Design a protein around this ligand. Structure first.
Ligand SMILES: NC(=O)c1ccc[n+]([C@@H]2O[C@H](COP(=O)([O-])OP(=O)(O)OC[C@H]3O[C@@H](n4cnc5c(N)ncnc54)[C@H](O)[C@@H]3O)[C@@H](O)[C@H]2O)c1
Ligand SMILES: NC(=O)c1ccc[n+]([C@@H]2O[C@H](COP(=O)([O-])OP(=O)(O)OC[C@H]3O[C@@H](n4cnc5c(N)ncnc54)[C@H](O)[C@@H]3O)[C@@H](O)[C@H]2O)c1
Ligand SMILES: NC(=O)c1ccc[n+]([C@@H]2O[C@H](COP(=O)([O-])OP(=O)(O)OC[C@H]3O[C@@H](n4cnc5c(N)ncnc54)[C@H](O)[C@@H]3O)[C@@H](O)[C@H]2O)c1
Ligand SMILES: NC(=O)c1ccc[n+]([C@@H]2O[C@H](COP(=O)([O-])OP(=O)(O)OC[C@H]3O[C@@H](n4cnc5c(N)ncnc54)[C@H](O)[C@@H]3O)[C@@H](O)[C@H]2O)c1
Ligand SMILES: Cc1ccc(Cl)cc1NC(=O)[C@H]1CC(=O)N(C2CCCCC2)C1
Ligand SMILES: Cc1ccc(Cl)cc1NC(=O)[C@H]1CC(=O)N(C2CCCCC2)C1
Ligand SMILES: Cc1ccc(Cl)cc1NC(=O)[C@H]1CC(=O)N(C2CCCCC2)C1
Ligand SMILES: Cc1ccc(Cl)cc1NC(=O)[C@H]1CC(=O)N(C2CCCCC2)C1
Lengths: 267, 267, 267, 267
């Protein structure tokens, strides 16, 4: 298997449609031994991850909780055994209050809300690296999930701004992680029809926002030279596993686009 | 003059070495009528701006103060006269707590501090646009100051992240400003030896940070095909005035590099 | 006027819809004294440029002709008078054989044809700089016309490749031009409905190619936060004049987007 | 093995220091069955490739020879057996006449020489795709070698321009290759001390050119957060194999940076 013998921490599972769920599944299919982290609804997350191919300990991690972050390495070590370290870390965490997305006007989002989104979606990539680098092996790999923010788009609003911040954080995390012989990269995925995204398309954050996302999805598959299936997270999960493997050893501070090639085409 | 008859708001003057001071001077030399905004030390700022070629009303604006922002358009209107609107707005505002820059480790900056920096340096570009767009004329221009954050660099740390966020905010502000017939752009300047920058080089945020910035400056002038003089803000001020003028009417959501061409050269 | 007293060479006029025609008109309105260069049909070009606001000498220049390039500086000097030099040069030249564009398959373009297109559209920017830099004043400006090639698009095919090459040539020309105190930049324009472009939309290079360009144009105005009028070259001409002026003195090796802001927006 | 059962064509071997030699070695270590192509010195190339872990047929291919390209698919089919197709193609071909590189002035390179370099280094990526796509399996992968040309640099001169053209060609090739279910990507490698590169450093294309490349190499390892070893092609070869594998299935028209992360860091 691609990840045989690797110990990998995967954050961000909340439903069976979470990108992290598919990352975890593919990593286990490829021989990785996982530790999972979940936010707030741990009973739910345990029941969800019961469906993964193999057993994996679940640890609580709210990335806005300083105590959780300060205890995290020790809790991971307890889970994988003293004297063992991680080979991989997956950050698949994102959040923006509803004022910061959808039809809610861009100018009307209070900074308190934007700040909460940037905390969870961008600063926490650095928070997790700080917490886990001391228990990572040389040759290891930190991977985060990104959505290409280099151009503005409808409805994504401040979440786009948070992703622009994350891309910058990643380049700095790479400097720190390099001291440990560890790589840091993001995977910029195309749109994936998770539960929350389906709810948005259905109008949860306003009708015109749903309409705009639907147009965005359609354009994506049209632009993608090999097409793009928003209902299939597996290609994205495979790409994360590629970055976790030994096969991209000279790539760091970087962004790998798992988007069907859409970002390379104007139309 | 390039800006004859234009009413322009300029924020960000705090010393005679502020980039905004030079923007204001050049804009006045080119016929613009200014309104100035200053943060906290208004007596100081008034004494500083007494040295500008012409009189300009000074208004208080702390961009973290919701009341200041809510009253700003009315205060500007009072200063320029009912029935008059602005043709231009200059955002020359930036701040990051010392934990977020210098030799202070990247991972050690508390989010409260980073958030304060992002508030002032990135979110406030949107805050000011929200406040002022309703009193801007079609054909008008909003300009912000940027430092190219597309690559990580030593010591700049979270301020780089804030600039990455600002570049994203600018692209969204352009969408809103377009509804008013108004352009929004950033000027990415090379390093300018302001008071604070000279203090950093002198070691105020740690010795190795000062050393690294000094190396950065030297490399900049070396890379720049037409050279780069860190002691001369005038080229930057001229570029801001170009964007405030009628001569770049089809440019918005964009970044103009006033950096000697350094970002186009590897070495 | 913005360009009062400046001596500027403008290449690329062939019809009254040429972008160069509008560049020349605006530059003359702003006080510039022009020298024009034309390819092959000089009687036609003279009759066309009779419609410009002021008289300007016309010189023959085929950029594939080594003798024309070797004699060009002396012929310009004769036209502007011994002891006078140019302050500006405008390259508004492009060509790709029909095999290299339209519905003709990308893989079917013979290299001889592609090479001819790259010669005229990219290498000639360096050819002209070589020829003219020795008779340019410090503070001068070389400007070329570009169409953003960072993403592939239908029908533009090898012309896109030639523009990618031109952007690279520009960054090297900036290194050479810097030795003379001269700037070199491109203006990346949105689509402009010139004679040839109208013919393409009308199906001259195949029906589906025309259809695709029409979709491209429509999308452009939709994406542009301030809109985009393909029938109006004046905004582009103004931008070229901005670069020819003294108001962007620290920009070189760079690309200024005169495209309504469309390239900053995904949709 | 990562590439078990895959039939892959590898071009560009000329010495045991060729990047293609290391690509071929790693691909064979991972179970790939190779077909090799060589230019001009086939006796030499056969003796060189005798050192690879396994036997691989060698075919002649001069990419400037239309007859070679027209016969190539049939010759490959003969080598791998009727009814078998390729899963992968590696383009590791580049050339620029000495007038187009080194201390020879940028402006002094004759177009005939530049054109020859662009033919071999950029157009041939499309030539090979045209030739081989009809005998490639769905899920297949075309990979080319790139050196990041987004910024100008000393001495690389017109080869940089050719790489800018190649990056554009790759985005179009991806459109064509998509019709076959095939991906097309480039790997942008850091500097590798091949025979020719060592000769350049030693002064073969002028003293100052050698000096500049040496400075470039040193800066590269300094900037790279995980370092960069110019004497080790294996990380680059592994990255090519990653792209040839099934593990990056949603990436096309793109560029993967195998450069130690140097391009993500300013200093
Ligand atoms: N869905 C897409 O279209 C798409 C596209 C590109 C990238 N991404 C990114 O992929 C990642 C995963 O998103 P997803 O689409 O799988 O949605 P998701 O809702 O399944 O995952 C988001 C995760 O963030 C977690 N989270 C929120 N607040 C947290 C906190 N305080 N502490 C810890 N975890 C917290 C949630 O519990 C959840 O597990 C995010 O970074 C998202 O931005 C998503
Ligand atoms: N100096 C450089 O090298 C350089 C390079 C590129 C860009 N820039 C940018 O140019 C802009 C101006 O910086 P500068 O170098 O002139 O330094 P400066 O210190 O003179 O200006 C920063 C300004 O921000 C103001 N400010 C801080 N907190 C504020 C608040 N709460 N509300 C309102 N204003 C507030 C300060 O009062 C000051 O006037 C900043 O955006 C900076 O990031 C500077
Ligand atoms: N029209 C658009 O949509 C558009 C958009 C962006 C950029 N541009 C660029 O603007 C420039 C001008 O194009 P245009 O649209 O005005 O079309 P145009 O046909 O009016 O101009 C092209 C010019 O190139 C000249 N030319 C061709 N071969 C030549 C040679 N051998 N020597 C000298 N001159 C030669 C032609 O005579 C003509 O004057 C080109 O670089 C084009 O790529 C055009
Ligand atoms: N060496 C580096 O520092 C470096 C860095 C990044 C990318 N690259 C790229 O990697 C690729 C391989 O270069 P390399 O460094 O291994 O050098 P190399 O000399 O070993 O390989 C270049 C190959 O191109 C072949 N070639 C030249 N003309 C040809 C023609 N007419 N038809 C077919 N093949 C022809 C040569 O025979 C040789 O096999 C090139 O694209 C190069 O630009 C090299
Ligand atoms: C592309 C786009 C446009 C507009 C809107 Cl409202 C949403 C999207 N898409 C998304 O929000 C996709 C991408 C993204 O970061 N998430 C996050 C998932 C976790 C909660 C915050 C949002 C889901
Ligand atoms: C380029 C660099 C590297 C490292 C450090 Cl510590 C500082 C700099 N440079 C600066 O901080 C320059 C650029 C910049 O945004 N400012 C801001 C000026 C206002 C207060 C916060 C910083 C001044
Ligand atoms: C954007 C696009 C797509 C497809 C096609 Cl066929 C044409 C265009 N557009 C153009 O060709 C525009 C842009 C451009 O470089 N020219 C050139 C004008 C001079 C002759 C060669 C083409 C005109
Ligand atoms: C980075 C740099 C700067 C200056 C010079 Cl002279 C050479 C280099 N480096 C190279 O030429 C490296 C990168 C590259 O494309 N090749 C090619 C190898 C095949 C023959 C043509 C050049 C080798």
């Amino acid at each position: 298997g691609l990840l045989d013998g690797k110990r990998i921490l995967v954050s961000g599972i909340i439903t069976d449609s979470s990108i992290a769920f598919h990352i975890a599944r593919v990593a286990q299919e490829q021989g990785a031994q996982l530790v999972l982290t979940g936010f707030d609804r741990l009973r739910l997350i345990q029941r969800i991850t019961d469906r993964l191919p193999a057993k994996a300990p679940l640890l609580e991690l709210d990335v806005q909780n300083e105590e959780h972050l300060a205890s995290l390495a020790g809790r991971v070590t307890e889970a994988i055994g003293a004297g063992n370290k991680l080979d991989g870390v997956v950050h698949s965490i994102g959040f923006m209050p509803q004022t910061g997305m959808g039809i809610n006007p861009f100018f009307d989002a209070p900074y308190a809300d934007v700040s909460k989104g940037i905390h969870i979606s961008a600063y926490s990539y650095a928070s997790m690296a700080k917490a886990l680098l001391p228990i990572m092996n040389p040759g290891g790999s930190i991977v985060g999930m990104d959505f290409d923010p280099s151009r503005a788009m409808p409805a994504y609003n401040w979440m786009t701004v948070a992703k622009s911040a994350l891309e910058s954080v990643n380049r700095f995390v790479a400097r720190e992680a390099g001291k440990y012989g560890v790589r840091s990269n993001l995977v910029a995925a195309g749109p994936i029809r998770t539960l929350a995204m389906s709810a948005i398309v259905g109008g949860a954050l306003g009708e015109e926002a749903g309409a705009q996302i639907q147009l965005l999805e359609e354009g994506w598959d049209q632009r993608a030279p090999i097409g793009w299936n928003m209902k299939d997270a597996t290609p994205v999960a495979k790409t994360v596993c590629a970055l976790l493997s030994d096969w991209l050893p000279a790539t760091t501070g970087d962004i790998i686009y798992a988007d069907g090639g859409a970002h390379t085409q104007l139309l």
